[PDB]
Each structure stands twice: as structure tokens, then as C-alpha cells.
Design a protein around this motif. Structure first.
Motif, short mmCIF file in Angstrom:
data_model
loop_
_atom_site.label_atom_id
_atom_site.label_comp_id
_atom_site.label_asym_id
_atom_site.label_seq_id
_atom_site.Cartn_x
_atom_site.Cartn_y
_atom_site.Cartn_z
N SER A 115 0.83 -1.22 0.00
CA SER A 115 0.00 0.00 0.00
C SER A 115 0.87 1.27 0.00
O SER A 115 0.40 2.34 -0.41
N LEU B 27 -5.54 -3.35 -1.53
CA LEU B 27 -5.90 -2.69 -2.80
C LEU B 27 -6.69 -1.40 -2.55
O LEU B 27 -6.49 -0.40 -3.25
N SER C 281 -4.28 1.18 -0.98
CA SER C 281 -3.36 1.55 -2.07
C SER C 281 -3.99 2.62 -2.97
O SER C 281 -3.29 3.56 -3.35
N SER C 282 -5.30 2.46 -3.29
CA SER C 282 -6.08 3.39 -4.11
C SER C 282 -6.22 4.75 -3.41
O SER C 282 -6.02 5.78 -4.06
N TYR C 283 -6.53 4.75 -2.09
CA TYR C 283 -6.67 5.97 -1.30
C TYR C 283 -5.34 6.72 -1.23
O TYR C 283 -5.33 7.94 -1.39
N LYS D 103 -3.00 6.70 -3.51
CA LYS D 103 -2.84 7.29 -4.84
C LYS D 103 -3.73 8.53 -5.03
O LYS D 103 -3.36 9.42 -5.81
N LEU E 41 -15.20 5.11 -1.81
CA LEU E 41 -15.08 4.31 -3.03
C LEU E 41 -15.96 3.05 -3.00
O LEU E 41 -16.39 2.60 -4.07
N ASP F 51 -12.33 1.68 -8.48
CA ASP F 51 -10.88 1.72 -8.63
C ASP F 51 -10.42 2.64 -9.78
O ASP F 51 -9.22 2.92 -9.87
N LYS F 52 -11.35 3.16 -10.62
CA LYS F 52 -11.02 4.08 -11.72
C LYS F 52 -10.80 5.49 -11.12
O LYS F 52 -11.65 6.39 -11.22
N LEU F 53 -9.64 5.65 -10.46
CA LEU F 53 -9.21 6.83 -9.72
C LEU F 53 -8.95 8.05 -10.59
O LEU F 53 -9.07 9.19 -10.11
#
Length: 319
Positions: free
Chosen positions: A53, A126, A129-131, A133, A187, A207-209
Motif C-alpha cells: 500500500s 488494494l 493503495s487506491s486511497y 494514490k 469508493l 478503482d477508476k481513480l
């Protein structure tokens, strides 16, 4: 909070994993993957946790998972002992674990933990990791809360306090559902979110950040942290509420969840495995220490005695 933010970033740069250390762990993972390849050609060794992450503190332990489609578990351990690695194989019921201690050259002080088909853990990583980013403020903030918790002796699940993941969810809840304007959207509750059932749990999120608009919150790291401490020290009532990522407002009572009588002293509902309370390790005496150290932090940051000794925020508390 200009001076505090300056201090925060100074501390952050000292406590974060070095690129050198990161590459060493990534090189170790490639070596272990080759070991698995010669015993099980269709199994994959996936990394999860803090290192994956990017919410990893210097000299952090490695967390791996072997994913497949039986005996491969023990068969992989014996091939690792053969390839110079030192450790032990432990299996409780049908859940095997490999706990590595050394290497005879990534060692000697080389720790690593291998699990088998722990899919939900890969998915929680995951999400985090997204947050990470989405906003640059999350990574320093998480590391600083983690460093504070560790130094203040409130990061021991085995000793009636909260896990590091517990604090990460405590940070996320605050940044999504408490702070206004919010730093992050939810999300999991996004209208673009699609259901994905893994091990009988919905692990789906948006997940489409790239299409997510930028944050409308422009507060500093210092201000964000001062708010986080102040919230959990004086506003959050754990006898009434559940920390959740499954309500649009973030409002969930212990009554509604049925978490009124595992321990429910501190209720942190896991985002994917909703049946599990991440704060089940927190005891009544332990919560008192957590509440006490949160109030201490708040008191320090609203000090009227200048210059404020910010260093005391990361001062080691007695065991």
C-alpha cells in the motif's frame, strides 16, 4: 498549523521506508517467487500489507500470500529451508503459515511472513493503495499516526490495544466521513462501484481513480492531524458508535449493527469482512490508554506556551 506541518514533514521523512530498503524487499520477493515456481508452476506469490500500500515505516516486516486454483504449503517451506532461508512452518487447523527469520544475502536480520490463500487481506491492501494514490496527505498522516501509536504503547493487539490497520481505518473514517470538506470519497459506496464477491464478501470499490475529481479540502497535514486527534479524543463515543465504511453519512450505531454484547469495546467495522471488528483486541483498560493518549495529543497541539515542544508527540511512553 504552519510550524506543526513543517515538523510533521520532517518526522515523516525520517520514519518512512527508504527506496534502498524498498528495493531490498522487492528483490527478496523475486527470489522467493522463483522458489515457489520450481515446486508449483501455476501458483503466484503476491505481496500485501504496508509495503504494498506504501504505508510502510522503516524496518517493516514483509507480508506475502501464495495464491492457487494442497501439500504445496509444506512442500514450499522445505524448499525454502533448502535454499538457505531460516524459519518455521506452523499450521492451525487448515491454516498454514511460514515465519522466516534469516538468510545465509538478504539476511541475517531479514523477517518475512507467508500466508496461504488470504485473498481478503490482498483486497484490503488494494483499497488502501487506491486511497494513497488519491491524496498525498494520506501516506504521511498514516505513518505519523502509526509512529505515535507505536511510541505511546497503544499499538499492541496482544496487550489490549489496537492494531496498525485499526489506526489506518480510524484515519480513513475521519478523512472520508468526519472532516468537512471530505479529503476522500467513499469508493465502496460510489454509484460506479460493482459487486465482487471474494471468500463470501463484497470486495468491490470504484478503482477508476483517474476519473475521481480532486479533493475540495485544502487543509495542511498539520491541521488534518490536529483535527484527527481532537475528534477521537473528545467527539467519538465508542459506547454508541461504530467506525464504518458502509454508511453514506458514516452514521452507524452499535444497536443497528448488533455489536452491543468477540469484544465490542471499540467497534471498527472492516470495510470488506463486515462481520469482523478490527477493534476486537481493544480491552476496557486498553481503550482508556488510547482515549488518554488522544487527549494528550489534542492538549499539546492547542498549547498556549510558545515554542510548543512538538517532539513530545513521539516521546516513548512507559510500558
Amino acid at each position: 498549523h504552519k510550524e506543526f506541518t513543517k515538523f510533521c514533514y520532517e518526522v515523516y521523512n525520517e520514519i518512512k521506508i527508504s527506496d534502498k530498503e524498498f528495493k531490498e524487499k522487492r528483490a527478496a520477493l523475486d527470489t522467493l517467487r522463483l522458489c515457489l515456481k520450481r515446486i508449483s508452476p501455476d501458483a503466484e506469490l503476491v505481496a500485501f500489507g504496508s509495503l504494498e500500500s506504501g504505508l510502510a515505516l522503516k524496518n517493516s516486516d514483509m507480508d506475502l500470500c501464495v495464491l492457487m486454483d494442497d501439500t504445496i504449503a509444506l512442500q514450499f517451506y522445505e524448499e525454502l529451508i533448502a535454499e538457505g532461508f531460516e524459519g518455521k512452518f506452523l499450521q492451525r487447523a487448515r491454516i498454514p503459515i511460514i515465519k522466516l527469520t534469516s538468510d545465509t544475502g538478504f539476511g541475517a536480520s531479514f523477517q518475512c511472513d507467508i500466508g496461504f490463500n488470504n485473498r481478503l487481506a490482498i483486497h484490503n491492501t488494494l483499497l488502501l493503495s487506491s486511497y494513497t494514490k488519491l491524496d498525498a496527505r494520506l501516506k504521511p498522516m498514516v505513518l505519523l499516526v502509526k509512529h505515535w501509536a507505536k511510541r505511546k504503547q497503544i499499538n499492541s493487539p496482544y496487550f489490549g490495544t489496537l492494531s496498525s490497520y485499526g489506526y489506518v481505518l480510524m484515519v480513513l473514517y475521519y478523512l472520508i466521513h468526519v472532516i468537512k470538506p471530505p479529503v476522500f470519497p467513499n469508493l465502496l459506496l460510489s454509484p460506479l462501484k460493482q459487486e465482487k464477491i471474494v471468500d463470501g464478501f463484497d470486495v468491490g470499490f470504484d478503482d477508476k481513480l483517474e476519473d475521481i475529481p480532486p479533493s475540495q479540502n485544502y487543509s495542511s497535514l498539520g491541521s488534518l492531524l490536529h483535527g484527527f486527534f481532537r475528534f477521537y479524543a473528545y467527539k467519538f463515543e465508542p459506547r454508541e458508535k461504530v467506525v464504518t465504511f458502509r454508511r453514506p453519512d458514516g452514521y452507524l450505531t452499535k444497536q443497528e449493527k448488533g455489536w452491543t454484547s468477540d469484544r465490542y469495546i471499540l467497534a471498527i467495522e472492516d470495510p470488506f469482512e463486515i462481520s469482523h471488528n478490527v477493534g476486537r483486541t481493544v480491552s476496557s483498560s486498553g481503550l482508556y490508554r488510547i482515549r488518554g493518549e488522544f487527549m494528550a495529543a489534542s492538549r499539546l497541539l492547542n498549547s498556549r506556551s510558545y515554542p510548543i515542544p512538538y517532539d513530545s508527540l513521539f516521546e516513548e511512553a512507559p510500558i
